[PDB]
Structure 1
Amino acid sequence: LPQTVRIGTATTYAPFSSKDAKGEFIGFDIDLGNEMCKRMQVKCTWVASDFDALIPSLKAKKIDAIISSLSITDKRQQEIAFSDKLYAADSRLIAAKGSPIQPTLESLKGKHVGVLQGSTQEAYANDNWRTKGVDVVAYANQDLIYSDLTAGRLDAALQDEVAASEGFLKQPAGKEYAFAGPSVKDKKYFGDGTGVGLRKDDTELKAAFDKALTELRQDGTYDKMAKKYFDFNVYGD
């Protein structure tokens, strides 16, 4: 293992990764990463990036790990390796309170839908919606999506369910918005929860992460950390 492990993350996805008022990194990803590093007995430097630059930066060795709500998908496994699951992550639509919008082509054709560049939601939205007449608009960071929704530039926005819920819907800025329909289920696109993204050849680093995460889950540190953010089981199955 390196003495310093460099972890990239996109700090605009509360409550998993964001910045406090002084610019320090906060969220459940941060806590998980810092707790794993503690147990791996390495130093960890967090590195902020747009989400869609994370996997390119990992391939170029500018970072060594990604902890950024990075969903474990089949396509991504072709390019990088993953730790064991850190938590589950369903996708879901948000729109203005009272809107009839559903995550269907029939409901969304002609409306403007925000998605994060590089995400599984952009992959899904591009294939099923954008080609068929939905104005799918891709954003560099998720904060910009929420803002464009509250200004009425967007009709709806597709992102991880818990990020939307805890990072926006339950905040003042999303008081007048809600989920539009239930979770969009599509195991192909959205993957099997999130994990630490790693280079394929870094078997020893993956092993160290996987073992730290088992240890912090076994002794109950996971749940203590998660209760700061969630009143439900974020881990899943």
Structure 2
Amino acid sequence: ALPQTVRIGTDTTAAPFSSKDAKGEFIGFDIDLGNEMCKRMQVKCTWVASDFDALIPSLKAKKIDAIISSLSITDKRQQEIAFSDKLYAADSRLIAAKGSPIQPTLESLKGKHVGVLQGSTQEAYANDNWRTKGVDVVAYANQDLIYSDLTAGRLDAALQDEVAASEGFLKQPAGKEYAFAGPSVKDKKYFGDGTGVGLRKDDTELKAAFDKALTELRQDGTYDKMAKKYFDFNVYGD
């Protein structure tokens, strides 16, 4: 007994997963995965653009029915919502100007201005480990503002999902002066185990339907073919 229409919230400032084209249409791997799952679930879907920090509150308030927005599956979030099976892996990594000495350490970052998406796992990590100890962690409503402040020289660095930074910024016109600063930062507590569709905990049938559709599109190679549009590596992980 699925609803006729499933409302999916997403933060469209995370190319190549979720963004808007020049005419305002939603594009990216998350959008492809969502549309493909909806097709297989035989439901209509409405995409809803939202600031990232509003997605979980909107889901709990029933203003949307699902989140597909590179939403990392973390222990903390499991206390509040449910998740589909893994959509893809997502590690975090710092970016800074090319030639910057910056590393993802307190010693390197103390007093420096570091941008993070408000509501993100990166904000949680940076707040607990960096802000408490004297890094100027600045939290933003969306990632476009982060990249804008970085290129304006207002930020020294920014922490976000690695593949989004690489494919959506470093390899794009705006990010040519920038590069990764240090290696990815893996931390089981903060960063979770890949991303998934966020769902209300009581929506057991909707979860089962998303899980079934995801399995199905992985089984028949649709996942790999869609992924190949964006990535020359195994985005799913393990």
Q: TM-score, normalising length from structure 1?
A: 1.00
Distance in 1 between the 2:76 and 2:183 partners?
25
Distance in 2 between the 1:187 and 1:198 partners?
22
Distance in 2 between the 1:176 and 1:47 partners?
33
For 1:37-186, list aligned pairs within 5 A: 37-186=38-187
Secondary structure of 1:173's aligned partner: helix
Distance in 2 between the 1:19 and 1:110 partners?
34
Distance in 2 between the 1:156 and 1:226 partners?
28
Distance in 1 between the 2:11 and 2:127 partners?
21
Distance in 2 between the 1:188 and 1:202 partners?
25
Query: Aligned-pair distance for 1:147?
Result: 0.7
Secondary structure of 1:33's aligned partner: helix
Distance in 2 between the 1:31 and 1:185 partners?
27
1:43-78 deviation line (CA, Å, top 9, x unaligned): 000001000000000000000000000000000000
Q: May I ask how many residue pairs the two structures share in their alignment?
A: 237
Distance in 2 between the 1:66 and 1:217 partners?
20
Secondary structure of 2:13's aligned partner: coil
Query: Aligned-pair distance for 1:8?
Result: 0.3
Distance in 2 between the 1:171 and 1:209 partners?
32
Secondary structure of 1:183's aligned partner: coil
1:193-213 deviation line (CA, Å, top 9, x unaligned): 000000000000000000000
Secondary structure of 1:182's aligned partner: coil
1:74-115 deviation line (CA, Å, top 9, x unaligned): 000000000000000000000000111000000000100000
Secondary structure of 2:158's aligned partner: strand
Secondary structure of 2:94's aligned partner: strand
Please provide the CA RMSD for this pair. 0.4
Query: Aligned-pair distance for 1:220?
Result: 0.1
Query: Aligned-pair distance for 1:172?
Result: 1.2
Distance in 2 between the 1:204 and 1:56 partners?
21
**Structure 2 segments unaligned to the other structure (5+ residues):** none
1:17-37 deviation line (CA, Å, top 9, x unaligned): 000111110000000000000
Distance in 2 between the 1:7 and 1:225 partners?
19
Query: Aligned-pair distance for 1:214?
Result: 0.3
Query: Aligned-pair distance for 1:141?
Result: 0.2
Q: TM-score, normalising length from structure 2?
A: 0.99
1:139-176 deviation line (CA, Å, top 9, x unaligned): 00001000110110000000000000000000111111
Query: Aligned-pair distance for 1:215?
Result: 0.3
Distance in 2 between the 1:63 and 1:173 partners?
32
Query: Aligned-pair distance for 1:185?
Result: 1.0
Secondary structure of 1:72's aligned partner: coil
Query: Aligned-pair distance for 1:11?
Result: 0.5
Q: Once the two structures are aligned, what percentage of the paired residues are identical?
A: 99
